[PDB]
Amino acid sequence: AKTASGVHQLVDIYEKYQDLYTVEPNNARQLVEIAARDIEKLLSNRSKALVRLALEAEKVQAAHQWREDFASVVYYNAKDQRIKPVFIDDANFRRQVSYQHAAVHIPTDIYEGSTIVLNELNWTSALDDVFKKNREEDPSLLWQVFGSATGLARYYPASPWVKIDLYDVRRRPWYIQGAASPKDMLILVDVSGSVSGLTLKLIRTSVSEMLETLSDDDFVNVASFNSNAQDVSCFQHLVQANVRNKKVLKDAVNNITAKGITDYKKGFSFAFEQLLNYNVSRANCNKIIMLFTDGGEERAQEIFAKYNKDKKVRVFTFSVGQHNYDRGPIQWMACENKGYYYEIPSIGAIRINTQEYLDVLGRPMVLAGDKAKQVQWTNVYLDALELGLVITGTLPVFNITGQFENKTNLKNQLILGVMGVDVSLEDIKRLTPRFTLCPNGYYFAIDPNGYVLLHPNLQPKPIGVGIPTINLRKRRPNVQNPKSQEPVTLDFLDAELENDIKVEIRNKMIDGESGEKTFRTLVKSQDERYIDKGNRTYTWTPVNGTDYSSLALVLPTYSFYYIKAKIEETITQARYSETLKPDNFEESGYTFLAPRDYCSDLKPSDNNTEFLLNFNEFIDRKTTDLINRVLLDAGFTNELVQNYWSKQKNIKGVKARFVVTDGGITRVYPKEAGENWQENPETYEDSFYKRSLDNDNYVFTAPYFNKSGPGAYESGIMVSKAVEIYIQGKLLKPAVVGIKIDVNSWIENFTKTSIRMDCVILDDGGFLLMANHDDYTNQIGRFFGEIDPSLMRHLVNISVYAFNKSYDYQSVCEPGAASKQSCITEQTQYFFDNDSKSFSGVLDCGNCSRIFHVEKLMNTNLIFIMVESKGTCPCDTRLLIQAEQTSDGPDPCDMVKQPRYRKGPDVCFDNNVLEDYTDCX
Amino acid sequence: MQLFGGRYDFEDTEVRRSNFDNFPQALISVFQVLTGEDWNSVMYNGIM
Amino acid sequence: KMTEEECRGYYYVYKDGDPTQMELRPRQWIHNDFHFDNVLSAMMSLFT
Numbered sequence A: 001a002k003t004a005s006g007v008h009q010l011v012d013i014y015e016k017y018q019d020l021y022t023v024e025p026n027n028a029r030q031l032v033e034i035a036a037r038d039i040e041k042l043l044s045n046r047s048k049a050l051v052r053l054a055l056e057a058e059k060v061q062a063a064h065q066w067r068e069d070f071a072s073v074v075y076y077n078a079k080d081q082r083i084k085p086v087f088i089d090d091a092n093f094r095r096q097v098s099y100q101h102a103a104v105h106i107p108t109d110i111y112e113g114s115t116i117v118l119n120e121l122n123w124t125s126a127l128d129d130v131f132k133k134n135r136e137e138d139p140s141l142l143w144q145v146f147g148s149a150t151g152l153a154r155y156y157p158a159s160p161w162v163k164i165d166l167y168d169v170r171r172r173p174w175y176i177q178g179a180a181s182p183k184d185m186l187i188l189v190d191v192s193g194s195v196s197g198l199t200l201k202l203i204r205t206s207v208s209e210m211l212e213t214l215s216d217d218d219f220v221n222v223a224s225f226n227s228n229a230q231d232v233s234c235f236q237h238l239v240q241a242n243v244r245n246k247k248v249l250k251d252a253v254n255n256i257t258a259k260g261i262t263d264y265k266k267g268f269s270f271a272f273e274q275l276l277n278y279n280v281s282r283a284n285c286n287k288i289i290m291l292f293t294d295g296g297e298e299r300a301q302e303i304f305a306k307y308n309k310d311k312k313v314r315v316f317t318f319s320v321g322q323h324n325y326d327r328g329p330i331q332w333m334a335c336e337n338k339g340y341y342y343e344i345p346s347i348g349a350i351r352i353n354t355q356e357y358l359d360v361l362g363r364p365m366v367l368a369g370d371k372a373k374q375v376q377w378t379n380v381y382l383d384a385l386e387l388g389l390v391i392t393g394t395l396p397v398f399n400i401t402g403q404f405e406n407k408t409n410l411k412n413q414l415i416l417g418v419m420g421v422d423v424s425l426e427d428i429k430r431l432t433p434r435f436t437l438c439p440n441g442y443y444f445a446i447d448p449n450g451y452v453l454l455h456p457n458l459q460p461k462p463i464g465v466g467i468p469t470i471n472l473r474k475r476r477p478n479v480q481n482p483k484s485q486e487p488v489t490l491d492f493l494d495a496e497l498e499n500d501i502k503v504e505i506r507n508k509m510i511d512g513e514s515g516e517k518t519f520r521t522l523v524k525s526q527d528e529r530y531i532d533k534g535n536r537t538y539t540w541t542p543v544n545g546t547d548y549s550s551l552a553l554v555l556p557t558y559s560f561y562y563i564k565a566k567i568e569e570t571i572t573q574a575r576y577s578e579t580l581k582p583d584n585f586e587e588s589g590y591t592f593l594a595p596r597d598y599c600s601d602l603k604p605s606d607n608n609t610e611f612l613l614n615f616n617e618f619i620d621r622k623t624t625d626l627i628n629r630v631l632l633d634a635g636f637t638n639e640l641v642q643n644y645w646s647k648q649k650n651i652k653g654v655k656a657r658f659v660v661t662d663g664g665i666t667r668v669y670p671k672e673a674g675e676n677w678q679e680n681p682e683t684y685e686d687s688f689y690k691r692s693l694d695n696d697n698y699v700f701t702a703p704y705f706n707k708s709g710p711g712a713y714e715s716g717i718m719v720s721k722a723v724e725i726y727i728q729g730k731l732l733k734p735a736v737v738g739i740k741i742d743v744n745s746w747i748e749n750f751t752k753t754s755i756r757m758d759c760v761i762l763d764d765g766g767f768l769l770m771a772n773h774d775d776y777t778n779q780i781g782r783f784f785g786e787i788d789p790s791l792m793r794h795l796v797n798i799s800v801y802a803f804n805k806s807y808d809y810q811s812v813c814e815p816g817a818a819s820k821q822s823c824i825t826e827q828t829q830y831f832f833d834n835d836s837k838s839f840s841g842v843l844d845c846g847n848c849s850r851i852f853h854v855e856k857l858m859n860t861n862l863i864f865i866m867v868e869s870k871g872t873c874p875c876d877t878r879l880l881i882q883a884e885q886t887s888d889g890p891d892p893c894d895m896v897k898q899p900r901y902r903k904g905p906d907v908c909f910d911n912n913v914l915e916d917y918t919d920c921x
Numbered sequence B: 001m002q003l004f005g006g007r008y009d010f011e012d013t014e015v016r017r018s019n020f021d022n023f024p025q026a027l028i029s030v031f032q033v034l035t036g037e038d039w040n041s042v043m044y045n046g047i048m
Numbered sequence C: 001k002m003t004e005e006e007c008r009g010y011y012y013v014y015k016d017g018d019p020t021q022m023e024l025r026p027r028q029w030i031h032n033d034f035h036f037d038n039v040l041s042a043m044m045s046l047f048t
């Protein structure tokens, strides 16, 4: 390893050129306080661009007139009088964009003409000049949008829409938070004998549609009332309503029987208990009870007289179905208790009725129009127009038409709509430098609920389902199968490894003000195989402006310092570019260049050859710190070719050498065997480069088996060493040099060392490197519990080498029984625990005995086992299986019990002495 | 009204509308069988 | 919808009441074919 690589010679290279550098600090605290000042300014400007859409949106409403007939309206109707304007290709939006006319999206449920719809296209044409101004006030803006209470939606860039499209903007995550407050909600399902048949299937449906209008500040709990009132939920109190906890209740709802006697008196007395307590958590805000019965001959005056003295719990009742019972008392229940009775005839009417429930709760906001205009940011979701992960900012729009003059004031209440301006996370991730700071380092951000904005494993493909059951006997060769308007709300304690130290970090970061902590942790390696253990130094600050985020910068402790590119000779860097041409592949090696940024580039879809040739052309025009670094990187890896690898020429051995540096230059030297380098050319998303920087010794990685393709005897295994540099009392780790061991050659040493019994060269990770005995020589790189589990189940039990079992929430699997779906998986990851590299044992599986002796090698990543036998009586107990097994999530009934620390918001509008509740009805 | 008692629940979306789930609904439905019109739909729903 | 102005466009016909199996139709007035408007049209329906 010391000879085949020129690591010590590459030490000689960085130590040779004492010029061309100035090692600069990171300070950390300084980088985060600077980056916090930028993410504020990002939100500052977009923040206001709602404020121009709110003020000029209200003014045109006050002068509208209300035209009844229409003989004059010329909009776009983005699903196909009508216009058909030009389209420019763009890369900010990766689609066709218009810039000159607003679009209009109308749901395919509601249109004719309509005196309601068409009259609202009249005045919302006036917004477009305000739309057009902010583009020229500020470039790089994403989808501005006016949603509306009647289902309309206008958005300025105008792109065509993305086979049956449901998409109702009145139920979309960003429209609901900006039109309400948090809700302690409680759904009660009448389950007597009177509801079997048509009215059963509706409630099973209508509850399942109600839970999708929740954000993640809302709380629910489902309580059938019957003879007695119980919670058919396994919760007995209020949940937090994650993505997850909403999935629990739907399997509870879809198995409700129907028989017994209605009472409404044990039921409500069970219900007003639940919204009390004040022990668990709750949002302490607009308390809703919702009552899904079918009619019943009771004005239950008693319970409201005992619990609604103060009238601080509003009651939505709904009646479903086509029973001929009384709808009498139920209309009395809501109209007294500030409710708003609605009625669900059948399927199809369900989507329209369960969304108007939010407009009723907007009544305290419309009575407090001075303070209520704050920008409420929704957390994170995938946009329906296919842009990536976006974050929205919302601000409601009121129907001020009667102010300071007053007037009759009939509908001085319910709002018009919600203005929205979306933000990409890439917009954020270009503010967050991740190119000076050591691939295990990364910015990172947490919302007040404990959810994530910038952890680098967000990865589109939404989360969190049980075992994804699909039958194929139920479907038809037909309809589109909806695309889950579900957000992507990842827990911080599930984005990484859970630890007693990190929970202290998370609970302080979610509200606190400064701080930092340095400690020892387990680190899950990328494309999970491997857990390392190392040190981290990481800080946090809240955003000086809003509270709706807080940053944090994770650092390896050897990463305070970095290399400054500084070339002031201009001939030396041109010679370094001369290395970087493809003409010199026999000279240097296949030199590959990671996709990075500058002025006018593109990304290589595996045509790194094209990107390199595109990159070659750039400096030839020029004949700003990333452009200088790669040039500075270019010759320092070249001198390992011409001064150490040029003098060797295809030894007894190696097969193929390689050098990965940060700055994105990787070189494989023979270049016939290099073209097979089958991994990621991105150094920061590279797997072994990061792992190599953690350890201070040699790292062996076992490739997979079958994997897609020729990773094999063809390939071999991988060696690595981080390169430590001693500048003037400092420690910098720029490069990683790798040797790719020819396997049969390393059999040939392993064979002749045996002749001068069952032995396994084994890694950390339980992956077979090599063995004797020739049955194992084809399995190479398979986890050894799939080979000899009787040893391995014993071997961990007589320790080293232990395991954690995380859960991943975004991997995709194959559905079971009763194409590609995301599902919650498990991941066993094996690691070393304990020192004292001498582990002997004597195994008796049962009725046959045999001998262990396990020897960890020194200054490297290697387990060497000597086991003696196979030929005695066998022991096929099980298989310790790595990889990912599709399984469930954690127990939700017990995760809720010791819940998870967090904070709610601070507005909670409720209960004006004004309002006046006579509508309902 | 005692043999069929409004047991016409079914859990579907089709309007099996000649139910017996009242008194005068049962009176009209019963008359239908005497005129011999459509007493399949009546009967098929009884045995289902 | 019940009314002349408010009944055009498209809507959702569900084959059996699973709210995923969702299909489209245009909607319009089905004038129900044995109508009582004119006394000529009435006697053709009292005949049935």
Ligand SMILES: *[C@@H]1O[C@H](CO)[C@@H](O[C@@H]2O[C@H](CO)[C@@H](O[C@@H]3O[C@H](CO)[C@@H](O)[C@H](O)[C@H]3NC(C)=O)[C@H](O)[C@H]2NC(C)=O)[C@H](O)[C@H]1NC(C)=O
Residues within 6 Å of the ligand: A003, A651, A652, A653, A654, A749, A753
């Ligand atoms: C496993 O296979 C290896 C081949 O990849 C063998 O490695 C070779 O071992 C030689 C002696 O053991 C080394 O020779 C030394 O090389 C250095 C410079 O490389 C010279 O300065 C030394 O003078 C020279 N030693 C002597 C006595 O002259 C090779 O460097 C080394 N590597 C190669 C050829 O790539 C291992 O020997 C082999 N293991 C066994 C047990 O056979």
Ligand SMILES: *[C@@H]1O[C@H](CO)[C@@H](O[C@@H]2O[C@H](CO)[C@@H](O[C@@H]3O[C@H](CO)[C@@H](O)[C@H](O)[C@@H]3O)[C@H](O)[C@H]2NC(C)=O)[C@H](O)[C@H]1NC(C)=O
Residues within 6 Å of the ligand: A060, A067, A072, A122, A123, A124, A125, A126
């Ligand atoms: C909503 O639609 C109506 C039309 O249905 C738009 O009203 C039109 O408004 C313009 C100016 O706002 C009027 O133009 C003026 O016409 C007079 C002639 O009477 C002319 O002398 C003026 O110099 C000016 O050109 C136009 O008459 C009027 N249309 C009708 C049919 O009355 C209205 O602008 C739309 N709303 C928004 C917000 O754009």
Ligand SMILES: *[C@@H]1O[C@H](CO)[C@@H](O[C@@H]2O[C@H](CO)[C@@H](O[C@@H]3O[C@H](CO)[C@@H](O)[C@H](O)[C@@H]3O)[C@H](O)[C@H]2NC(C)=O)[C@H](O)[C@H]1NC(C)=O
Residues within 6 Å of the ligand: A065, A066, A120, A399, A401, A410, A411, A412, A416
């Ligand atoms: C914003 O608030 C104002 C509050 O007045 C709303 O204006 C009112 O809207 C109603 C809608 O029904 C208008 O009623 C209509 O009146 C015509 C007049 O002949 C009648 O024929 C119709 O049948 C209908 O009932 C009412 O006139 C109107 N008020 C005034 C003073 O014009 C306005 O609509 C609200 N905006 C939105 C988008 O809801």
Ligand SMILES: *[C@@H]1O[C@H](CO)[C@@H](O[C@@H]2O[C@H](CO)[C@@H](O)[C@H](O)[C@H]2NC(C)=O)[C@H](O)[C@H]1NC(C)=O
Residues within 6 Å of the ligand: A277, A279
């Ligand atoms: C949570 O609410 C319950 C009410 O259900 C409270 O329970 C009572 O606790 C006191 C002591 O604090 C006992 O003396 C009572 O016997 C309990 N009630 C009943 C009905 O047994 C409880 O205090 C609340 N707080 C916590 C932290 O649990």
Ligand SMILES: *[C@@H]1O[C@H](CO)[C@@H](O[C@@H]2O[C@H](CO)[C@@H](O)[C@H](O)[C@H]2NC(C)=O)[C@H](O)[C@H]1NC(C)=O
Residues within 6 Å of the ligand: A033, A544
């Ligand atoms: C928002 O950030 C500014 C700038 O950091 C804060 O100003 C700090 O004020 C303290 C005194 O309380 C000084 O000791 C710090 O040196 C200041 N910061 C800097 C970078 O110099 C301001 O206090 C923050 N806002 C709030 C409310 O805490």
Ligand SMILES: *[C@@H]1O[C@H](CO)[C@@H](O[C@@H]2O[C@H](CO)[C@@H](O)[C@H](O)[C@H]2NC(C)=O)[C@H](O)[C@H]1NC(C)=O
Residues within 6 Å of the ligand: A606, A607, A608, A609, A610
């Ligand atoms: C990526 O793009 C380059 C184009 O520069 C491809 O290289 C060419 O491959 C074709 C055959 O596939 C040869 O005939 C050409 O001579 C190659 N060179 C050039 C300059 O065109 C490369 O194959 C592409 N890779 C993939 C996977 O498509």
Ligand SMILES: *[C@@H]1O[C@H](CO)[C@@H](O[C@@H]2O[C@H](CO)[C@@H](O)[C@H](O)[C@H]2NC(C)=O)[C@H](O)[C@H]1NC(C)=O
Residues within 6 Å of the ligand: A522, A802, A803, A804, A805
């Ligand atoms: C994940 O792995 C770590 C390995 O350190 C486990 O942490 C140790 O747990 C033992 C007992 O289980 C304690 O005695 C040690 O103090 C822990 N060490 C550290 C560094 O925390 C952890 O328990 C594992 N978690 C799971 C779920 O398996």
Ligand SMILES: *[C@@H]1O[C@H](CO)[C@@H](O)[C@H](O)[C@H]1NC(C)=O
Residues within 6 Å of the ligand: A038, A041, A042, A045, A137, A138
């Ligand atoms: C916000 O807008 C102002 C004025 O338009 C501009 O100076 C500033 O650069 C913008 N913020 C960012 C982060 O670009």
Ligand SMILES: *[C@@H]1O[C@H](CO)[C@@H](O)[C@H](O)[C@H]1NC(C)=O
Residues within 6 Å of the ligand: A251, A252, A254, A255
């Ligand atoms: C109802 O179905 C759910 C989901 O399969 C299951 O968890 C529950 O135990 C079932 N209850 C009964 C009584 O079958």
Ligand SMILES: *[C@@H]1O[C@H](CO)[C@@H](O)[C@H](O)[C@H]1NC(C)=O
Residues within 6 Å of the ligand: A520, A533, A534, A535
């Ligand atoms: C982390 O740093 C501490 C002190 O600098 C050191 O004792 C410890 O060995 C380091 N962790 C590892 C895994 O080396």
Ligand SMILES: *[C@@H]1O[C@H](CO)[C@@H](O)[C@H](O)[C@H]1NC(C)=O
Residues within 6 Å of the ligand: A705, A706
């Ligand atoms: C892949 O390896 C497995 C061993 O688990 C083997 O059963 C399978 O046959 C291999 N794939 C192919 C295509 O042979």
Ligand SMILES: *[C@@H]1O[C@H](CO)[C@@H](O)[C@H](O)[C@H]1NC(C)=O
Residues within 6 Å of the ligand: A797, A798
């Ligand atoms: C393995 O560890 C478990 C942990 O409790 C222990 O109960 C068991 O005795 C150990 N196995 C053996 C063979 O001693």
Ligand SMILES: *[C@@H]1O[C@H](CO)[C@@H](O)[C@H](O)[C@H]1NC(C)=O
Residues within 6 Å of the ligand: A798, A799, A800, A834, A835, A836
């Ligand atoms: C290492 O493991 C052995 C048993 O495998 C145990 O007795 C010993 O205490 C361990 N040492 C440490 C430092 O944990």
Ligand SMILES: *[C@@H]1O[C@H](CO)[C@@H](O)[C@H](O)[C@H]1NC(C)=O
Residues within 6 Å of the ligand: A846, A847, A848, A873
């Ligand atoms: C167990 O031991 C007995 C002798 O006591 C032997 O006859 C038998 O074959 C053994 N069975 C196994 C499964 O090892």
Ligand SMILES: [Ca+2]
Residues within 6 Å of the ligand: A192, A193, A194, A262, A295, A296
């Ligand atoms: Ca009843």
